[PDB]
Amino acid sequence: ETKLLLIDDNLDRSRDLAVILNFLGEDQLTCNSEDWREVAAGLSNSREALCVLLGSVESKGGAVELLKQLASWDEYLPILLIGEPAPADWPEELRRRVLASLEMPPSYNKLLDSLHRAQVYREMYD
Amino acid sequence: MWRETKLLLIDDNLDRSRDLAVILNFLGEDQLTCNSEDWREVAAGLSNSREALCVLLGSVESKGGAVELLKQLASWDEYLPILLIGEPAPADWPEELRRRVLASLEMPPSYNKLLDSLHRAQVYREMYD
């Protein structure tokens, strides 16, 4: 019984992403870079979070900093990039957790396939 | 066997209408979006009524009601199927109209029912072409 973790500072895209995820019957919590810890404290524990859906981080230290934090919160939490460049920028270590970099809106298939991939990833890593 | 088509979204509930557009956009389903006061104007931009696969119909605050709206749609093209969004087809309605409503979609829709309803639409279009 898991929830997706939707972390994206572009509010408009977020609202659209949630609409699609609800349509898809995929549960999710909606947070930004500033408040994601609070919202994530709503979950029993961290393993309730299947995957992070990540858009744009407008906080101090950017996506890479948010990501460092995510992996100290749960280093087995895989990431899904949506609507943002694939960055060769990121250190390999935290590029590792990024299952796929998807377009906005993602294709129906890519999205489902990638969520399936996040299922398996969590599972193999428990 | 085919031709290119578009969905026609008529819904005065604007937040629902925007949400529906996001979903259809996600689905790759070309569509035109309107409310009841401007639907004629928006629809005119089609080549003809036959490029409309079907109507997704929401709430109608038009002078009169959705019943009248259905009536105009029918005169326009009587083979143009209707999908009720967010509304069970009222048992109150007259069969000539009811005969055209193929499905009622709960909000937010199910992927499999939306697809099933679009399929019924296509079977219906091409039956009377």
From Swiss-Prot, chain B:
- Record's superkingdom? Bacteria
Phenotype upon knockout is: Deletion results in the concomitant loss of motility, mucin adhesion, and the ability to synthesize flagellin.
Q: What does this protein do?
A: AAA+ ATPase enhancer-binding protein that acts as a transcription regulator and plays a role in the modulation of mucin adhesion and flagellar gene expression. In addition to flagella genes, also regulates expression of biofilm-related genes. Functions as a transcriptional repressor in the absence of c-di-GMP and as an activator when c-di-GMP is present.
Q: What is known of its domains?
A: The N-terminal FleQ domain mediates dimerization and is essential for function.
Subunit structure of this entry?
A: Forms homodimers. Forms homohexamers that inhibit transcription initiation. Interacts with FleN; this complex is formed in the presence as well as in the absence of c-di-GMP or ATP.
How is this protein named in the record? Transcriptional regulator FleQ
Mind giving the lineage of the organism this protein is from? Bacteria, Pseudomonadati, Pseudomonadota, Gammaproteobacteria, Pseudomonadales
Q: Which gene encodes it?
A: fleQ
Q: Which residues of the full protein are shown?
A: 1 to 129 of 490
